[PDB]
Amino acid sequence: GSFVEMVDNLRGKSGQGYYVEMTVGSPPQTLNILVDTGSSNFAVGAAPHPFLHRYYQRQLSSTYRDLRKGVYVPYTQGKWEGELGTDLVSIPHGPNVTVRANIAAITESDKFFINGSNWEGILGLAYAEIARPDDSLEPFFDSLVKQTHVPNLFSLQLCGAGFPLNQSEVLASVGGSMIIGGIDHSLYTGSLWYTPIRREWYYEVIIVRVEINGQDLKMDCKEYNYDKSIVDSGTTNLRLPKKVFEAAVKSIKAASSTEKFPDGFWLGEQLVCWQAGTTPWNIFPVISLYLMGEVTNQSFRITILPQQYLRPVEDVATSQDDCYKFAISQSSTGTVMGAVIMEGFYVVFDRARKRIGFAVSACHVHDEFRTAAVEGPFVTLDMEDCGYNI
Numbered sequence: 001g002s003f004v005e006m007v008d009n010l011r012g013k014s015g016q017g018y019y020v021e022m023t024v025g026s027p028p029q030t031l032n033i034l035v036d037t038g039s040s041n042f043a044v045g046a047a048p049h050p051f052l053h054r055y056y057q058r059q060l061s062s063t064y065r066d067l068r069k070g071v072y073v074p075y076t077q078g079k080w081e082g083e084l085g086t087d088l089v090s091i092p093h094g095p096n097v098t099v100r101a102n103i104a105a106i107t108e109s110d111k112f113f114i115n116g117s118n119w120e121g122i123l124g125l126a127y128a129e130i131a132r133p134d135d136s137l138e139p140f141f142d143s144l145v146k147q148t149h150v151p152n153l154f155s156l157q158l159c160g161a162g163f164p165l166n167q168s169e170v171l172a173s174v175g176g177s178m179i180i181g182g183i184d185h186s187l188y189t190g191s192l193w194y195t196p197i198r199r200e201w202y203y204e205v206i207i208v209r210v211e212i213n214g215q216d217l218k219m220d221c222k223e224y225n226y227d228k229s230i231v232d233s234g235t236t237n238l239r240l241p242k243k244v245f246e247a248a249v250k251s252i253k254a255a256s257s258t259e260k261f262p263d264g265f266w267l268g269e270q271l272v273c274w275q276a277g278t279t280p281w282n283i284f285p286v287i288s289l290y291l292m293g294e295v296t297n298q299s300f301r302i303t304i305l306p307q308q309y310l311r312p313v314e315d316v317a318t319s320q321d322d323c324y325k326f327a328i329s330q331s332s333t334g335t336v337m338g339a340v341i342m343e344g345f346y347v348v349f350d351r352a353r354k355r356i357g358f359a360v361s362a363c364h365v366h367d368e369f370r371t372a373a374v375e376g377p378f379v380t381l382d383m384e385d386c387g388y389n390i
């Protein structure tokens with residue numbers, strides 16, 4: 001590990017998001033910021049809100065610059081409205097650099113802020129093509145690279161605990177690492193495998209094959225990427241295109257048929273509980289996602305365990321049972337590889353080489369019999385045809 005200053009700089013959990021500490025303004029105003037590879041705007045609460053115990057105060061910053069422009073971002077989940085400006089930004093547990101970046105000061109929001117998440121803003125790490133109001137609003141990471149010597153690359157190690165974290169526990173727990181400008185080798189085991197970033201907007205990738213316990217889901221691979229597949233730390237679940245979701249759930253039910261689970265469970269709405277320590281991990285199948293490799297006709301696979309797709313949740317009775325919600329859900333906007341999937345891997349966003357790397361995470365949750373895996377290579381033909389075109 002060569003980036004020790006950034007190791008363990010994340011806090012949070014899949015259900016409420018992972019955040020990094022940042023400072024905005026002069027003198028510096030400390031704020032916790034959601035790490036979101038699924039959007040491209042740097043936005044912070046800038047006005048009182050029931051769920052915020054602190055917010056960006058522009059009138060207290062000598063370096064604040066008002067852009068005199070409004071901004072609106074409608075996420076899949078929620079929305080916020082704000083005022084555009086720029087100011088000096090730093091990451092305390094990051095590269096020792098200060099940059100002037102665009103900041104959307106949030107003045108109105110609906111279903112955006114999460115009660116108890118402990119974060120006051122969002123860091124959209126994706127490309128300008130999806131930034132609001134338009135692609136002219138330079139994303140934070142672009143500013144960072146243009147203004148400093150920081151390598152055009154960042155890596156994420158999101159660490160799920162494998163068990164419920166209460167309100168005090170999640171505040172004192174290390175939730176992972178965001179390494180700005182590099183790859184830290186202590187965060188993963190085995191080899192890193194790269195998949196091409198298909199297009200620079202979201203971090204778009206191409207899935208070429210899907211297996212449930214080694215059994216081919218056997219769908220036209222173009223279904224797996226309808227209308228796109230993205231890597232998104234700002235989404236909890238593995239979200240799958242309607243048809244893929246239906247087929248995957250049918251296969252996961254078949255593999256786990258020794259136990260019957262209520263429809264509410266499969267809909268990701270209701271929790272299932274087992275007596276402490278008795279979770280039957282072995283009846284649930286591993287899920288393998290094959291990703292286009294950098295070599296022609298070559299792919300690699302990332303394999304996740306139910307310890308990743310079953311999300312730990314506190315029992316409504318706070319009892320001693322181990323409870324979980326099914327963290328795979330349907331999408332109408334393509335595949336979303338959310339935080340529960342990212343928790344099994346060290347993920348390298350290699351912007352400079354337009355590729356995303358995957359390696360088994362040093363902090364993924366597993367059991368004595370199975371482990372998450374990143375394996376390759378596999379001969380795979382016509383992978384370009386798995387990509388969806390409008």
Ligand SMILES: CCCN(CCC)C(=O)c1cc(C)cc(C(=O)N[C@@H](Cc2cc(F)cc(F)c2)[C@H](O)[C@@H]2NCN(Cc3ccccc3)C2=O)c1
Nearest residue numbers: 015016017038039074075076077078112232234235236237
């Ligand atoms: C991560 C905590 C839990 N959580 C959000 C609260 C339920 C989710 O798991 C979850 C579930 C669903 C269905 C969507 C999203 C959800 O939109 N998450 C967004 C961030 C986010 C995080 C958050 F905690 C609250 C938000 F209101 C938005 C992502 O950016 C998402 N990725 C692609 N995209 C499309 C897009 C990109 C750029 C501009 C417009 C649209 C998105 O909206 C998150």
